Amino acid sequence: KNFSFRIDELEEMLTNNRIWRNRTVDIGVVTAEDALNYGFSGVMLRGSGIQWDL
Amino acid sequence: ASKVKQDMPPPGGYGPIDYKRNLPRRGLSGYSMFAVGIGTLLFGYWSMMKWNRERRRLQIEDFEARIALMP
Burial of A19 (0-12, 13-18, 19+ CB in 10 A): exposed
Q: Which residues contact B24 (CB under 8 A, 6 or more apart)?
A: none
Mutate which of B18, B20, B26 to test chain A, going by most A C-beta atoms within 10 A? B18
Q: What was the elucidation method?
A: cryo-EM
Distance separating alpha carbons of residues B21 and A43, to the nearest angstrom? 19
Distance separating alpha carbons of residues B16 and A1, to the nearest angstrom? 8
DSSP secondary structure code for residue A38 in this structure: T
- End-to-end C-alpha distance for chain B, whole angstroms: 122
The resolution, in Å, is: 2.9
Sign of dihedral through CA atoms B17, B19, B20, B26?
A: positive
Chain B contact present for A5, CB below 8 A:
yes
Distance separating alpha carbons of residues A26 and A38, to the nearest angstrom? 19
